[PDB]
């Protein structure tokens, strides 16, 4: 936290914790549905499912193979993007929107694309 | 006192030649509680 700054560290901590929760309940999710999760947890899981999907981004050297134009996102931008998502400030739009896209702004724009 | 409550007390008294069954006894005994609420805010779960 002294290196990447407290704000980064806090953001990263929350990402790790959410994803770890999601992994922990991965078993429970399979055995019984999402609606048989505890309500508090169910929020965590829904958010985490989004976070997990958010982590994918197209790659530009893979642009040929994948067929998706790559996205290079600034470090300053990355910290901001995840920070918002953890506070659920964009949790209200499709999981598909989060999947394979660049920055937070791109997720928003793709929500409009999906909305059509 | 509500009409169906009035009838209810009579029904309860009515489970007393004799010919007694479990369904009757269950129909006259309940452990349910009713929790008043306000606002969120919760005045207690007084026994029903």
């Amino acid at each position: 936290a002294a290196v990447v700054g407290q704000e980064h560290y806090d953001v990263a901590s929350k990402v790790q914790e959410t994803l770890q929760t999601y992994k922990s309940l991965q078993d429970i999710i399979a055995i019984l549905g999402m609606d048989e999760l505890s309500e508090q947890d169910k929020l965590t899981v829904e958010r985490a499912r989004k976070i997990q999907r958010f982590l994918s981004q197209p790659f530009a050297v893979a642009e040929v193979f994948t067929g998706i134009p790559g996205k290079l996102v600034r470090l300053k931008d990355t910290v901001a993007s995840f920070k918002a998502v953890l506070e659920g400030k964009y949790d209200n739009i499709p999981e598909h929107a989060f999947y394979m896209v660049g920055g937070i702004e791109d997720v928003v724009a793709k929500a409009e694309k999906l909305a059509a | 006192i509500s009409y169906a409550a009035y009838l209810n007390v009579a029904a309860q008294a009515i489970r007393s030649t004799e010919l007694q069954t479990a369904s009757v006894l269950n129909r006259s005994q309940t452990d349910a509680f009713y929790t008043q609420y306000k606002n969120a805010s919760e005045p207690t779960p007084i026994t029903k």
Binding site: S13, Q16, E17, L19, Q20, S24, L32, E36 | -
Partner: protein
């Protein structure tokens, strides 16, 4: 690992999952034992932490039950609330 465990007088297990859980130190409280035990800690600290071990162990047990679902009695949820803290 087998050889060393026998030789040594305590084990201070860390656990990767608990690291991710954000518990740092990630000491896995149940697997961690001190076979030289309490008579090496500060007398004051021994007094205060007397049932701390019992509480944590109970928290672990309760937590397992809690993840098999179903509503838990209030006494158990006292444990759960305390345990979390």
């Amino acid at each position: 690992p087998t050889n060393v465990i026998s030789i040594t007088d305590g084990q201070i297990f860390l656990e990767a999952e608990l690291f991710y859980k954000g518990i740092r130190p990630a000491i896995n409280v149940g697997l961690s034992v001190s076979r030289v035990g309490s008579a090496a800690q500060v007398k004051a600290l021994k007094q205060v932490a007397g049932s701390l071990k019992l509480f944590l162990a109970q928290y672990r047990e309760v937590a397992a039950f809690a993840q098999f679902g179903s509503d838990l009695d209030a006494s158990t949820k006292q444990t759960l609330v305390r345990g979390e803290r």
